[PDB]
Amino acid sequence: MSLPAHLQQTFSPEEIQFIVENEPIKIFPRITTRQKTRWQLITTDDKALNNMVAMRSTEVVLWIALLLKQQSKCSIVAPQWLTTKELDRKIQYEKTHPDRFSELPWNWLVLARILFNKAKDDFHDPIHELRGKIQDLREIRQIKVLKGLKYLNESHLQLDNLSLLEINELRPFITEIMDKLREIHTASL
Amino acid sequence: AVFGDRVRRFQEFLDTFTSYRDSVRSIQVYNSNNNILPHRIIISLDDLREFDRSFWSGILVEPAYFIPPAEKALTDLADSMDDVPHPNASAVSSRHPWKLSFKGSFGAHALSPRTLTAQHLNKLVSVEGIVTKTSLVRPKLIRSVHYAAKTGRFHYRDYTDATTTLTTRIPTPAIYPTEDTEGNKLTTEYGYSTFIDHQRITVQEMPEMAPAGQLPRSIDVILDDDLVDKTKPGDRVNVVGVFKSLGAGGMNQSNSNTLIGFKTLILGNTVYPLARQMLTDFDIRNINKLSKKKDIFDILSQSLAPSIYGHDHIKKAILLMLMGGVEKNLENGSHLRGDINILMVGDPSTAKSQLLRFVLNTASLAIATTGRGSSGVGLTAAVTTDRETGERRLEAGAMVLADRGVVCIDEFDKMTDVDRVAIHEVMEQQTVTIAKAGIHTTLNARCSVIAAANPVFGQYDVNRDPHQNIALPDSLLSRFDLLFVVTDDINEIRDRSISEHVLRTHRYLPPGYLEGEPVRSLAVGEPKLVTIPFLRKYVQYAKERVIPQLTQEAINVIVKNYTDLRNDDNTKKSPITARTLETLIRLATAHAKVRLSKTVNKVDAKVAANLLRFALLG
Amino acid sequence: GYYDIDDVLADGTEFPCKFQYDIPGLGYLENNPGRPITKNTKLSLPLWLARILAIVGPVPFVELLPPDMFSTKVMNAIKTDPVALDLHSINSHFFSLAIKWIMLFSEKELANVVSELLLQRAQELNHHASSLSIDLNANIATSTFLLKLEEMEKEIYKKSHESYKDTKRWMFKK
Amino acid sequence: DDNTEIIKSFKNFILEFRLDSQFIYRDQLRNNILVKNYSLTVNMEHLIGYNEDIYKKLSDEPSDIIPLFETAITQVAKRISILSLPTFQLILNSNANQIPLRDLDSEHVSKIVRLSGIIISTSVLSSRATYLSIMCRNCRHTTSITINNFNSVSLPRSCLNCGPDPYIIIHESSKFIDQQFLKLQEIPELVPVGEMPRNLTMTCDRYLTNKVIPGTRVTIVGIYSIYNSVAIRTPYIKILGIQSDVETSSIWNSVTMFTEEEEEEFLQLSRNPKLYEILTNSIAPSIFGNEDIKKAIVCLLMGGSKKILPDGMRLRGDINVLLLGDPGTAKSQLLKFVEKVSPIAVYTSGKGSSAAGLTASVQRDPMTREFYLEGGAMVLADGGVVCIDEFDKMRDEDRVAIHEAMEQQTISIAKAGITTVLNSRTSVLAAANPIYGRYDDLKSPGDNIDFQTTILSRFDMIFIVKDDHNEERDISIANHVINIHTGQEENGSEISIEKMKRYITYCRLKCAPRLSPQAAEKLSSNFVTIRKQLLINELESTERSSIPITIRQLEAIIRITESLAKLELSPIAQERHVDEAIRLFQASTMDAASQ
Amino acid sequence: MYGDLGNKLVLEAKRTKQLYARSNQDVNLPMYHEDIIRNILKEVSNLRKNTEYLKEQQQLGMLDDKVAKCQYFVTLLCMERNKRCLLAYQRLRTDILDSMAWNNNGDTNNLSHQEQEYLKEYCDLITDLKSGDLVDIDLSGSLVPPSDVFIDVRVLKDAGEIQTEYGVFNLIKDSQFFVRQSDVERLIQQGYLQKI
DNA sequence: ATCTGCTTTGGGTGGGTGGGTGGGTTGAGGCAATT
DNA sequence: AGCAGAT
Ligand SMILES: Nc1ncnc2c1ncn2[C@@H]1O[C@H](COP(=O)(O)OP(=O)(O)OP(=O)(O)O)[C@@H](O)[C@H]1O
Ligand SMILES: Nc1ncnc2c1ncn2[C@@H]1O[C@H](COP(=O)(O)OP(=O)(O)OP(=O)(O)O)[C@@H](O)[C@H]1O
Ligand SMILES: [Mg+2]
Ligand SMILES: [Mg+2]
Ligand SMILES: [Zn+2]
Secondary structure (H helix, E strand, O other), X not given: OOOOHHHOOOOOHHHHHHHHOOOEEEEXXXXXXXXXXOOOXXXXXXXXXXXXXXXXXXXXXXXXXXXXXXXOOEEEEOOHHHOHHHXXXXXXXXXXXXXXXXXXXXXXXXXXXXXXXXXXXXOOXXXXXXXXXXXXXXXXXXXXHHHHHHHOOOOOOOOOOOOHHHHHXXXXXXXXHHHHHHHHHHHHO | OHHHHHHHHHHHHHHHOHHHHHHHHHHHHHHHHOOOOOOEEEEEHHHHHHHOHHHHHHHHHOHHHHXXXXXXXXXXXXXXXXXXXXXXXXXXXXXXXXXXXXXXXXXXXXXXXXXXXXXXXXXXXXXXXXXXXXXXXXXXXXXXXXXXXXXXXXXXXXXXXXXXXXXXXXXXXXXXXXXXXXXXXXXXXXXHOEEEOEEEEEEEOOHXXXXXXXXXXXXXEEEEHHHOOOOOOOOEEEEEEEEEEEOOOOOOOOOOOOOOOOEEEEEEEEEEEOOOOOOOHHXXXXXXXXXXXXXXXXXXXXXXXXXXXXXXXXXXXXXXXXXXXXXXXXXXXXXXXXXOOEEEEEOOOOOHHHHHHHHHHHOOOEEEEEOOOEOHHHHHEEEEEOOOOOOEEEEEOHHHHOXXXXXXXXXXXXXXXXXXXXXXXXXXXXXXXXXXXXXEEXXXXXXXXXXXXXXXXXOOOXXXXXXXXXXXXXXXXXXXXXXXXXXXXXXXXXXXXXXXXXXXXXXXXXOOOOOOOOOOOOOOOOOOOOOHHHHHHHXXXXXXXXXXXXXXXXXXXXXXXXXXHHOOOOOOXXXXXXXXXXXXXXXXXXXXXXXXXXXXXXXXXXXXXXXXXXXHHO | OOOOHHHHHHOOOEEEEEEOOXXXXXXXXXXXXXXXXXXXXXXXXXXXXXXXXXXXXXXXOEEEOOOHHHOHHHHHHHHHOOOOOOHHHHOOOHHHXXXXXXXXXXXXXXXXXXXXXXXXXXXXXXXXXXXXXXXXXXXXXXXXXXXXXXXXXXXXHHXXXXXXXXXXXXXXXX | OHHHHHHHHHHHHHHHOEOOOOEHHHHHHHHHHHOOOOEEEEEHHHHHHHOHHHHHHHHHOHHHHHHHHHHHHHHHHHHHHOOOOOOOEEEEEOOOOXXXXXXXXXXXXXXXXXXXXXXXXXXXXXXXXXXXXXXXXXXOOEEEEEOOOOOOOOOOOOOOOOOOOOEEEEXXXXXXXXXXXXXXXXXXXXXXXXXXXXXEEEEEEHHHOOOOOOOOEEEEXXXXXXXXXXXXXXXXXXXXXXXXXXXXXXXXOOOOOOXXXXXXHHHHHHOOXXXXXXXXXXXXOOOOOOHHHHHHHHHHHHOOXXXXXXXXXXXXOXXXXXXXXXXXXXXXXXXXXXXXXXXXXXXEEOOOOOOOOOOEEEEEOOOOOOEEEEEOXXXXXXXXXXXXXXXXXXXHHHHHOOHHHHHOOEEEEEEOOEEEEEEOOOEEEEEEOOOOOOOOOOOOHHHHOOOOHHHHHOOOEEEEEOOOOOHXXXXXXXXXXXXXXXXXXXXXXXXXXXXXXXXXXXXXXXOOOEEOHHHHHHHHHHHHHHHHHHHHHHHHOOOOOOOOOOHHHHHHHHHHHHHHHHOOOOOEEOHHHHHHHHHHHHHHHHHHHHO | OOOHHHHHHHHHHHHHHHHHHHXXXXXXXXXXXXXXXXXXXXXXXXXXXHHHHHHHHHHOOOOOHHHHHHXXXXXXXXXXXXXXXXXXXHHHHHHHXXXXXXXXXXXXXXOOHHHHHHHHHHHHHHHHHHHOOOXXXXXXXXXXXXXXXXXXXXEOOOOOEEEOOOOEEEOOOOOEEXXXXXXXXXXXXXXXXXXX
């Protein structure tokens, strides 16, 4: 009908990327738009863009930042959680707590993929090391998800600190299996 | 430590379920009254799973560490039950512990000889297949008891082997002790020693279940004590046991190969046949009610091979052959056979082979052979050597294996004279005489032969006499009760009918499948057409508990028919003889069997006469 | 659902039944047409007919006998090893008929058995759906397990496999 | 010392190897552990790219480093799947030049080699030890041993007084793996001048077992080594990888080995409106004319559909074709092509064959003195096609030994105690000559054919190919053959042998059409007319027809209809296929009978 | 029995759904099963005749209450089952037609005349919806989020100098453009352009 | 006088660079000569 | 286990 069958009840990875690209990020303008034309937006705030000064930290929407970076007119400042040391700490936290997920942002995978693809010269650590660390973290969280899937039931379930992309991956299996369990239980009464 | 705990846990299981206790008590009572039941108990794995999951999982995955405790617990229970006042010295010295046997549902351990791999070693498995070999039963020493005359006390010694127990122990050579610890002379007391029987069989994968272009595989099995002679070659069995490995497997420096694996085999716990149907009171009453019908013969005959058009009389003959006659042996020595042999000769594509295959599938026991695929030795028996003991013996052939059953011979005319002689002897005498390799014996082969042959020129010729049309000897021909000559005569109505029937048959779709889907257990213990299973039950019942006797009226009918038949101008496709009288009596007796009657009446004689007349004079 | 094709197919399976009255002119239910159907007759009717005949009729018109798909043997096989069991052969719409049966008779033993079977099977279902092949230059187990899946499990597996495949394609898109 | 460093190096390859943005081996390992396949297939071109030094070690001493790369894989697998598992198998892929089977000699001992051949025999699986638990006879001291299957191991000779060899294995605590033996014969073309083909013994482990069947061409990567059975050693190859063009696993079990992407191609090809023409043109592109025989060969390759009735009767689903004709007709070339296109096929000459050579033969093992059964041509071709050339030279007995296997598709044996009924579901494609070499029209048809009616009725379609001297056709054939001699369409009018073979496999394992009522009525009317036509022809001539028309021909027409339907993945066979089937039957068997 | 034809029709509907799911881009509705539907409706007609005969017999006949109830119940249930199967098949086909109508901006021999009329007036409805207050949005637009502003595209099939709303594009076969995705999104949808 | 060490039966848990004039002997299948 | 050899 109006909506394809693969977009029903769930989001596509491109939809998740679209959602992620509206969060603010920090950039270093390579131009001085501030006056001592003008941006006119309706979906976000435009004061920051109208007030830019060379080599001065400022915050804008992620998609505008990517558009500016495409023109070599801004250098994205990578988040603080995306350094080598922070990823080692998160890996250690995951290793020592088999029964819980680490406190990574809800967009760590998507943002990592976007920034590695687009801004390769804006990180202060070698890119290969960061890719390896993210891969390790993904494997640990996958083990934890596999172990936690054994507690599906006709009642609620809790998956704290699970990120958006992982939840999107698992939404069909979890929802349908739990729905069938609920249907059986309800038929029982 | 753990062993005692497990024995306690199994003892608590036997307490919770009282059926096993009742069975043990009944076995002991029956033994006391007395021929003798063995000390074996069948436990349901499902009940054990319901009771204690850990014990069930251990018995399925680590039987070595969990079966001996259960056997000991059962033996302790039985001993606590025993109340025999005076135990005989043999009984006191006897080493006869209670053995455990399993049933129920094996989830993923239900396998076949092809699917057994190294991953399944040291686990309880159930295997299905055909028994192809069977060694000779030889006693095996377990315990020896001696007597010291001077000291006046008995001693004993315990022996163990790799195949007599599930846990590895130090080997014990079978040398009997001769001197006491202090140097006294010891005399063995054989009457108080303990020996058990021992046999090894080979189970082969079912040929029809094999992959494409691969010959079936087999596995070796060991049966001890009361499981020794529960199977014979050619039987379909389901064997439960523990998959093991033996020997050093080339790890000893004597063998320099360095590329040979370990030996493997199964120690059986149970054997389950897959041949006789168990009749219920409902089945018996239904059989009787049907037999009271006046057209039961026609219904049963038509029910045979519903997918073959026509051939009513051949189907009737096949029914009478499945029922058989009555075997009589006289005091003087004459031994009259009660089996019916049938020969079909006709043009190509007349459904002879399909009738043979249907008889193969329906009959309780049936062996398949062809003309060019068989041999004289392969039909009677072969001389081989026993691997276990290295002793000369005989292996039964197709005719011997089919004793008290049926043997279907396809392409009877493509055999050789040397191979035809064996069948001639078997049909003439119903026995097999063997004189080879210093062996003299007489094997029993009491089977019914149903065969199909082609004329000499590949198509029956009406002009030429029957002798010129068939290449088989007259002596061999006289041994067939009914000779059916079937011709493919082109006709319009008949062709339309047969073509419509074939087209209808070719459009069948089995339930559980979609259109265009090409065609491809759960437990081990466990004018309307009559279904094949009910036909088998009817045949079993009738040929098991009916022995009709002749009566003067049937006698008059038979004598009149024989007299008229022999001296009649009309030519016969086969020559009348005194053997025709025996065939008439046999057919009448078989038809009486069909009706579940104790006497042969006029109707049976009139049916036999009509069948023989159709066979002889079309 | 009324328009759900799988449900329409499921409602068409045959269940054993036993009539309890004497109804002339109902032969077509039996093989023969145009003959009276005597009482205590045993015959297999489609679910959409048998259910309504069983609830409508005091003594209803028919009584539902235990189907061979919910027998003791099948339950024991389910409990022993759920993953290895071949559900497709027992019935291609096993779970739907099971839910309908539970609702009809409100029996909880079957409910618990079926729930445990479904959970244990779903574990392996996700194990297989999560496994995505790779091409180095530029299997058997997965196929044998797929052959055994029931229709509803086959839909769930397809959906999960497509979701995993889409996420992997997006993440490693050059 | 060095072993730990080598293990560390191979562990860093599995954790650091990325060609773009995907870790190929880390992800391959996780995906394999999830489906219970404890192995990793590594391409040696990737290892030569990470660090050439690691390849130098793996190639200089293969049986010492391969065991240290397996333990690295196991450690990485534990790190990836277990949040704090037997030793993992390593399967290798290489593109190095293939050494001919007969060129392997002392210069290649203990080296990685690649070679091709034909598998002629496979053994029953054995069990090799991987972890022994041992005990001492006297002092009862418990110990364990660990074994890798790479030979250059035995129980300790001295205990840890205790006499020599004091240790006995405790079996209920040991673990074993699977081992298989294979015989590899060299390809017929590679063989040197005037030499018999040579064999070579091979062994595979764990996940490389039950991967091949006798008679299939394979490519092998392994180690050419030696084992002592005086100062000579018998060579053998330790398999490290198997690659084959035949999906034997799909053929024995279900449908497998077809990717969804590969499966999509087959559906697209089936949707082609004129797939029949493409397949007909794709058979023997180098043989001119003979379109009807090529359509018959397409139908034979496709096969019908087999039915098992409730009462137990089985209906044959294969099609048998006979080619009778004059010399130079290209019957042998058609047979040699069909042997090469079919997934399973055997080419045999009726003269150089025997009753036991076909079917199965009884053989005695010289060691055990026990008779066993070995399959012949019809068993080796099970599930495929047998091409019996020179069908007229076969002896009467050897030909009679084929009736049951051709009709009932089973080989009943009763010899030397062995009593069984094997399975042989094969299609026979036979070529023969008339009595006088050329079909002489002057004499009656009963004089040109020495085959009996029984054997002939078993053939679905009989082609009596006659060579007529026509100037136009002769010029056309001359031009075609000269073009062949002096001289690639692949534009939707022809598909290569590989694609056609894969499509045959897919169709056979995916479709089994059924007749609709209209087709049944049509075929039934046609059978009545054909039988009447034989009777009118017979009444005219005293002689009894030499080519028969029995119920088997009706079943053959049904099989041809079903094969034509299956060709296009149509679950139902309609009249549009019945008409073609009737046309082919009239073009071959009624044509032969009319003369 | 009395629902075998409906079961066969629903099986064909299932096959149609499976084909639609498997197919990647090109979907063609199988030929409308006119024959099976004709047979089903004929069967419903005989069932109606049976109900009328039963009522007539009850009005003047020896029939009893229980027997009449049972037969009148078994006939009604059969009619209901046939109706359900028919409606399920038709609804599946209509859903695929809706999907096709939305995929285009707004062969046919397979469809029955009723389905042809349905599709025509449904496209009319879609265009009417597009004409309303949602004009600024291209309701039958692309459902993939916009990611890149400028894309490289290649002309897949030769055509004249098509004059789109956004401008003039000289669609020469085998020629590349550096343009904004928003402008050439329709041409990509039709197949005149490819993203590469 | 004591300690150290090899090899059977006969059989494939020694083999075919030890052979069959050192014994393990029927069954099947192919080939020449006889027909 | 009996017999063949080295300390
Ligand atoms: N009366 C019949 N009804 C149905 N099928 C028949 C009939 N007669 C022959 N056939 C068909 O004949 C086919 C093969 O013939 P069959 O093998 O039964 O003949 P046969 O008498 O053993 O021939 P031959 O002399 O070649 O050994 C079977 O598929 C069966 O379908
Ligand atoms: N279109 C063709 N028709 C006939 N022969 C051809 C054709 N193309 C090539 N040939 C030649 O046919 C020869 C092969 O012989 P062919 O297969 O025709 O013999 P046959 O008739 O089957 O056998 P025989 O002569 O023993 O009866 C090869 O030399 C090949 O070059
Ligand atoms: Mg036959
Ligand atoms: Mg030739
Ligand atoms: Zn010791």
